[PDB]
From Swiss-Prot:
This is Flap endonuclease 1. Residues 1-99 are annotated as: N-domain. The gene is FEN1. It comes from Homo sapiens (Human). DNA binds at residues 46, 69, 130, 203, 205. HAMAP family: Fen (MF_00614). Changing residue 159 to A: Fails to translocate from nucleoli to the nuclear plasma. The lineage of its organism: Eukaryota, Metazoa, Chordata, Craniata, Vertebrata.
DNA sequence: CCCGTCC
DNA sequence: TCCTCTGCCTCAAGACGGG
DNA sequence: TGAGGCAGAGGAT
């Protein structure tokens, strides 16, 4: 994401953040970065220091998390579409390349979660590149109400609305924090292109940031000079030298014109979970408790009925 | 609440 | 002297409930 | 990985 962007918005554009009761979201569609969720589950869902697993050692922490987080959302009337990352851009790979077993999401984790989601009737999409960019595209085209993510990248990708820390709001019984991009730009007095340059200065996954430039300086410089190139000419090279081989022009273009899925091609449905196949998969292969799975499918089934009744005469 | 299980 | 940033550290990132 | 709480070294004023 963007280093410190969340903190900055709260401190400088407080009106861009609204708190709404969770009831008021009943019926709404949200886009979710599924690769980011799998990673959180692999890291946090542990016992004795190891992931949950079946007898033969296959990882199940990610299925555990995806199954119950998704059902909890549906019970609050929030309808998720999961976006899976595609091949990362060159800059992301290059920046990672420049930078206790280390957790990593594999194609196998993705495929297993895709298989679970299909048996649950939960829609998912494959982004051609960055999932957050495609999430932004779904919000922009009106296919979902918001991206539900902790990665402020979506904002840099133009997502008009972002639901921040949704699952912690659910677990702790707190209102949901909604970020409104337009309000951000209005409070900072910036346009989207200037915001992207600011985000790069704060620190992005695509490229390096100027050493000695942090949140306070970057806001002031972007407001007066309006672009990174105009800033670098005015900056004193002895005091604040830029990093060599700086790829900010390239990172700017990635944020402005990301490869994204076509949102008009997207068909979205939340269909009846397949209880018998879920049992064979989660219990027969993954050794989840059958009593717990059945209970989760029943809650998900009942969730669909309430969503359908609430939305039948109120299409979105 | 505290902290262990889930697989 | 004050403001701003950087390093270093530490922690928690899930969902849920039994006791 | 990031994000909050502190330490302190600079340039900022």
């Amino acid at each position: 994401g963007i280093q410190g962007l969340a903190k900055l918005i709260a401190d400088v554009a407080p009106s861009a953040i609204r708190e709404n009761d969770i009831k008021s979201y009943f019926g709404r569609k949200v886009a979710i970065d599924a690769s980011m969720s799998i990673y959180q589950f692999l890291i946090a869902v542990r016992q004795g220091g190891d992931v949950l697993q079946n007898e033969e050692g296959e990882t199940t922490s990610h299925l555990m998390g995806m199954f119950y987080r998704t059902i909890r959302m549906m019970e609050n009337g929030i309808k998720p579409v999961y976006v899976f990352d595609g091949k990362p851009p060159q800059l992301k790979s290059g920046e990672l390349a420049k930078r206790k077993r280390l957790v990593k999401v594999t194609k196998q984790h993705n495929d297993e979660c895709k298989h679970l989601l299909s048996l649950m009737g939960i829609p998912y999409l494959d982004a051609p590149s960055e999932a957050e960019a495609s999430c932004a595209a779904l919000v922009k085209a009106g296919k979902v109400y918001a991206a539900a993510t902790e990665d402020m990248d979506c904002l840099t990708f133009g997502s008009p609305v972002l639901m921040f820390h949704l699952t912690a709001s659910e677990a702790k019984k707190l209102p949901i924090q909604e970020f409104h991009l337009s309000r951000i730009l209005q409070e900072l007095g910036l346009n989207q292109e200037q915001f992207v340059d600011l985000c790069i200065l704060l620190g992005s996954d695509y490229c390096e940031s100027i050493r000695g430039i942090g949140p306070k300086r970057a806001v002031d410089l972007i407001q007066k000079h309006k672009s990174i190139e105009e800033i670098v000419r005015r900056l004193d090279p002895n005091k604040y030298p830029v990093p060599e081989n700086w790829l900010h022009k390239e990172a700017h273009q990635l944020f402005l014109e990301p490869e994204v899925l076509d949102p008009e091609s997207v068909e979205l449905k939340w269909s009846e979970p397949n209880e018998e196949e879920l049992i064979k998969f989660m219990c027969g292969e993954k050794q989840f408790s059958e009593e717990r799975i059945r209970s989760g499918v029943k809650r998900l089934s009942k969730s669909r009925q309430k969503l359908a009744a609430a939305l039948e005469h109120h299409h979105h």
